[PDB]
Design a protein around this ligand. Structure first.
Ligand SMILES: Nc1nc2c(ncn2[C@@H]2O[C@H](COP(=O)(O)OP(=O)(O)O)[C@@H](O)[C@H]2O)c(=O)[nH]1
Ligand SMILES: O=C(Nc1ccc2[nH]c(Cc3c[nH]c4ccccc34)nc2c1)[C@@H]1CCCN1
Ligand SMILES: [Mg+2]
Length: 170
């Protein structure tokens, strides 16, 4: 089978995890998607000449059992850590996501990309510099996106795949 990349989108409720995933998979912006729904989506794509499958888990937070959370973190190869540029709390939550994923996988080298969503809004509480400062400390890429206009979306997911490749080659 073609190579499959298991990607996990995490982040506080309302940041745009679902909008981002649906924009990537289906090429349209969904204004309203039930915040409590969590599912996986698939799309066959070509990244740097490689035909591959993206298998993406659109997370929604607490699970029936915490074991389910741990299971998808061990299963996931790469993680989009999403905050919204007008939601400071969501940006502060990144610390917890970074920590928890590393903790569950028991690894210091987990492919991640920092994603600042809703870049189409002039309303902003989190400056680019402040997110760059965090990304720098993590040694991971940072990309500002808009699920609304699609700006940065392919870049976000494709960069995460490229981070997975760099991890695999070690
Ligand atoms: N303006 C703007 N709104 C967005 C963007 N992404 C998501 N939203 C809106 O933010 C709200 C929550 O998005 P959603 O995908 O459900 O967030 P999630 O809970 O993290 O999946 C919805 O009303 C979306 O329409 C974006 O890039 N720009
Ligand atoms: O399916 C759900 N949740 C859920 C929870 C954990 C899951 N793990 C997987 C396996 C998977 C598919 N693609 C992935 C990419 C990264 C990590 C895990 C997966 N599906 C999952 C679906 C809920 C229940 C009713 C309908 N939505
Ligand atoms: Mg959602």
């Amino acid at each position: 089978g073609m190579t499959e990349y298991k990607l996990v989108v995490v982040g506080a409720v309302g940041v745009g995890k679902s909008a981002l995933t649906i924009q990537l998979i289906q090429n349209h912006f969904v204004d309203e998607y039930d915040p409590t729904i969590e599912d996986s989506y698939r799309k066959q794509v070509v990244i740097d000449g490689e035909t591959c499958l993206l298998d993406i888990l659109d997370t929604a937070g607490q699970e029936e059992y915490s074991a389910m959370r741990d299971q998808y973190m061990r299963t996931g190869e790469g993680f989009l850590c999403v905050f919204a540029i007008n939601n400071t709390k969501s940006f502060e939550d990144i610390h917890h996501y970074r920590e928890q994923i590393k903790r569950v996988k028991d690894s210091e080298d987990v492919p991640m990309v920092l994603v600042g969503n809703k870049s189409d809004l002039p309303s902003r509480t989190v400056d680019t510099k402040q997110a760059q400062d965090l990304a720098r400390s993590y040694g991971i890429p940072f990309i500002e996106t808009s699920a609304k206009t699609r700006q940065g979306v392919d870049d976000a997911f494709y960069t995460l795949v490229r981070e997975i490749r760099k991890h695999k080659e070690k």
